[PDB]
């Protein structure tokens, strides 16, 4: 169905033990047209001393988001949902309930 | 302006050194009507031995997302943008460039 629609850091990326970089993702047909996506800097995590540790891993936190997209095409739009890397966390193989 | 719109885990939350819980957030007037939001389980981080450590902190990763919202009200909609807690990371007071 079709619906009418009106229209409207503490720098953790560096201080995190699973640090990350942002990579630009542009589509002139998508709203938002620009999405900066996180990529983990390491395979392991930075320990308290600033060294890479392979007893743990940096893994990205992905999120499902809504985006508008021109169809096929700038007048009519489609609501779409995409997977986006937001940041990184540090995990180990152990499950702590 | 108004635009016409058509319509369409590896359990890190437990294996993370900055673990988190999901809290439900419901609005029957919002699309998505349900958003599960992350809350850090601790102030510090879990070290490799499974103990809470206050040399580091769990902090949430927030993200700006698009949502549809009934105006004022179920026929016409408004595109809105909200802040959402997606997961947690582990930081320290040190900036590692």
């Amino acid at each position: 169905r079709t619906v009418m629609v009106n229209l409207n850091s503490s720098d953790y990326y560096n201080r995190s033990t699973s640090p990350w970089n942002l990579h630009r993702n542009e589509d002139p047909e998508r709203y938002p047209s620009v999405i900066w996506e996180a990529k983990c800097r390491h395979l392991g995590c930075i320990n308290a001393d600033g060294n890479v540790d392979y007893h743990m891993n940096s893994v990205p936190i992905q999120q499902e988001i809504l985006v508008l997209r021109r169809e096929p095409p700038p007048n009519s739009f489609r609501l779409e949902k995409i997977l986006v890397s937001v940041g990184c966390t540090c995990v180990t193989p152990i499950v702590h309930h | 302006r108004t635009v016409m719109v058509n319509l369409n885990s590896s359990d890190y939350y437990n294996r993370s050194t900055s673990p988190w819980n999901l809290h439900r957030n419901e609005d029957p007037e919002r699309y998505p009507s349900v958003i599960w939001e992350a809350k850090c389980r601790h102030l510090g981080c879990i070290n490799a031995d499974g103990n809470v450590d206050y040399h580091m902190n769990s902090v949430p990763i927030q993200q700006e997302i698009l949502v549809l919202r009934r105006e004022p009200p179920p026929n016409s909609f408004r595109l809105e943008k909200i802040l959402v807690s997606v997961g947690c990371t582990c930081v320290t007071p040190i900036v590692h460039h």
Partner: antibody
Amino acid sequence: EVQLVESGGGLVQPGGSLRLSCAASGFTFSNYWMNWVRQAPGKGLEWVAAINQDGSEKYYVGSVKGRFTISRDNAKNSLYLQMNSLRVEDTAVYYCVRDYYDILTDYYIHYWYFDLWGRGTLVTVSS
Amino acid sequence: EIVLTQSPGTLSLSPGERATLSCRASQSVSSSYLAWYQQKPGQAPRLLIYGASSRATGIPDRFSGSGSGTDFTLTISRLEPEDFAVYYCQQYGSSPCTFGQGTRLEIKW
């Protein structure tokens, strides 16, 4: 019947390279985390490396940083260990092992213990 | 790292007797996440126990475990000559997983 079959072991000079393979059969390999555990001749068991179901997560003992690489080919039902810059101290019997897991509340719970072991493959580093 | 120390180094007992093996940890082991393995001469290890006290599949009830924190035991009752093996404990509550150095069990007359 479940089985893990290692191959690739041998006698190398210090500084040498070696690659161990381990072939899995009788189970869905892509459902398991897999590890390499070693045992120096006449000595104890020591963990080397871990890898999750899709190889998006690789873990290593400190003594092998920059030297060993754990990998998997889920289509070939195989686990690998690329061992470069081999040292006399790497002399051991290398076992590939599969990690136990549960499905509780419909969440995959990995447990870092080994419910299946291969026969092992001997790696001798000597000049 | 959690360092696991096993005792005795070598244990010698007669058939029918009960063997008690200890596994002590340098720091408390989380959620009783402690396993035991049996490695008979010339064979790969076999899981015996998980979660300190639960028996792995195919493991007879004469093998039993107990313990928490920094001290764990493995009991082998009605000792049989086939029990001649090295027994290892392994924790999986802290990263990296670690093993004890083993207890050598031998059967005597």
